[PDB]
From Swiss-Prot, chain A:
Possibly a dedicated protease for substrate gasdermin bGSDM; cleaves the bGSDM precursor, releasing the pore-forming moiety, which integrates into the membrane and triggers cell death. Involved in defense against bacteriophages. When this probable 4 gene operon (bGSDM-FE772_23060-FE772_23065-FE772_23070) is inserted into E.coli it provides nearly 100-fold protection against phages T5 and T6 and about 8-fold against phage T4. The operon without bGSDM no longer protects against phage. It comes from Lysobacter enzymogenes. The chain holds residues 4 to 97 of 641 of the full protein. Belongs to the peptidase S1 family. This is Probable serine protease FE772_23065. It is found in: Cell inner membrane.
Length: 94, 91
């Protein structure tokens, strides 16, 4: 198998300016059934909550969809387009 | 063309326009119109318009999952969520 690489999850966690609440709302929308519910992630996060959520999204192959959701909300908050595109470039495909 | 699946999701969901719009913002791919574009374009039911665009741009399945996830948090019965997911199908 492939060893888990969380560098892309770490990059997204170090990029987004959304609140925990907006990140949670994105997660609830994009979460596939085989990924843990948001409350499970919240209860599990020893350190950074957003990092925990993005690690789970990596584990369950939906970090690309979660990154797109985060980018869409940042775009509505007038985050500059090239910064959204930089994030999307860094996070990649799942 | 045939919007049967978008129409069925429109009838099935009990979410508010606000929650549907929040789902749409999260799942919308770049080639699909932004939520504010959809709202501006809608002449009839807003949820129907959103779900027709999701059908057009091949993400109605992802939007249906988002809808089901919020319905689940509102205690919608599990089998009703699963019925909806079966009717929407794959994109």
């Amino acid at each position: 198998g492939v060893q888990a690489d969380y560098s892309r999850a770490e990059a997204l966690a170090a990029w987004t300016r959304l609140s925990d609440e907006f990140i949670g709302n994105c997660y609830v929308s994009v979460r596939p059934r085989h990924a843990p519910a948001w409350e499970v992630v919240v209860a599990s996060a020893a350190g950074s909550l957003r990092l925990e959520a993005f690690k789970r999204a990596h584990d369950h192959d939906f970090l690309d969809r979660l990154a797109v959701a985060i980018g869409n909300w940042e775009q509505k908050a007038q985050r500059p387009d090239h910064e959204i595109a930089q994030m999307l470039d860094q996070v990649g495909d799942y």
